[model samples]
Target: GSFTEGWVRFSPGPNAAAYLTLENPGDLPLRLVGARTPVAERVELHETFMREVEGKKVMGMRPVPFLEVPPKGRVELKPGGYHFMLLGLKRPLKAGEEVELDLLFAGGKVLKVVLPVEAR
Candidate 1:
């Protein structure tokens, strides 16, 4: 998976989330199975979907059943969409600090990235 234009939103809370776009430039579609981050107690692949109930808006996440990146196409992991939820932040993630993340693929490949923190 090739990461480009990746970013994380800064929130004043115990947890923060990061968003990035992944491209599978190879011939085969890549499956993003999981992820890990040092800044949080744990990280997971999340997909967000919205539903309306009783005339109210509700958003929630489901463990990525699987993420398939079409060849030469980009899979976007963004806010209000698919994203990485960094839970139990070990320390405050301030602007300018670098956050490292490891993306695990179904094909036994791990992609490591260092993204700078940014204010939302």
Candidate 2:
């Protein structure tokens, strides 16, 4: 398993998001169950979608139990897509800061990842 295009969005409030491209090389599918980061009190996996609000279109996000990456496949995380939701931030996230994450996967698998915070 490997990752590419990893980065976190800079935020001035208690919330922020991290995006990445997850690649799976093994025969079995990879399940991303959750994550832990020192910068936030807790992390959640979220996906965005457009919802109707009184005949108007609005964007909303919801927590997912897990995200899957098939064998020899890739999962792209970006704005309005799948992303890591950081909640109750300990401090404001600034550009150039590297965030540390312990990504928890199925079967007790964990990966330590570092993602740079960017303004984009």
Candidate 3:
């Protein structure tokens, strides 16, 4: 697996989110298409951007079909950036607990990552 620094924020509510640092070490580009987790009923890729609203800057998120990483390149999912939005959580996630996320990519490749829940 070329995934590193994978983590999920512990959310007390029904909504939770996660981030992943992906590295493409192969010769060709790779596309991250989808994600799945038992902790949430639905998982989707989301991108955050800044928007201006009535003279104020507001953050917005939009669902994206996929994210691409160039060959030998890196894609980082962080706050105010790309992320995995976990909706309809089954239960509240606690810190230090591990959750398995299966990331679906192009070329029929799937990466299983165990991300620890963190306070941050």
Candidate 4:
């Protein structure tokens, strides 16, 4: 699996999310299991889910164990979708700066990404 167009949202608060386009060009699925960043105290793989809340369908996010990039398919991590959660930031993320984001996958494959910070 290869990732591109990755960026982390600039955050003055303690939390932020990262978005990226990842492509898996093979016969087997690639498992996205973990992430780490120097600027954040912890990282979690998140998934957006829908559930009933007082008769209305409400959408929310929760941490998931892992997610898979399908075989020969592409996965987009965008706002309100699948994203990487950076919680308990060590410092505020600012625009025009970059941070190291290391992605951990199954089978011991790792992708060390340098993601630029953006306002949006």
The best candidate by TM-score is: 3
- Candidate 1: list runs displaced more than 4 Å: 1-3, 11-13
Better of 1 and 3 by TM-score: 3
Better of 3 and 4 by lDDT: 3
Q: Which ten residues in a row have the lowest lDDT in candidate 1?
A: 1-10
lDDT of 4 by residue, 1-120 (tens): 355777898887679889877767789888878899898888889887778989998898988897779898877778768889999998798998888888797996987778688888
Candidate 3 deviation (Cα RMSD)? 2.0
Expressed as tens digits, the lDDT of each residue in 11-83 for candidate 1 is: 5558888887777768888888778887788776778899898999997777766677887888878777898
lDDT tens digits by residue: candidate 2, 1-120: 455668887998779998877777789998888888888887889998888999998898889998888998988778868899898898699999888888787996876777789987
Task: Using lDDT as the measure, name the better of candidate 1 and candidate 2.
Answer: 2
Q: Across residues 1-48, which tens digit of lDDT does each residue of candidate 3 receive?
A: 555777887987678999878778799998899999988999989999
Q: Pick the candidate with the highest lDDT.
A: 3
Candidate numbers, best TM-score first, in rank order? 3, 2, 1, 4
Which residue ranges in model 2 land beyond 4 Å of their true spot? 1-3
**Judged by lDDT against the true structure, how good is candidate 3?**
0.86
RMSD over all Cα atoms, model 1: 2.5
List where candidate 4 sits over 4 angstroms from the true fold: 1-3, 55-57
TM-score against truth, every candidate: 0.83, 0.86, 0.88, 0.81
Q: How far is 94's C-alpha from truth in model 1 (Å)?
A: 1.8
TM-score of 1: 0.83
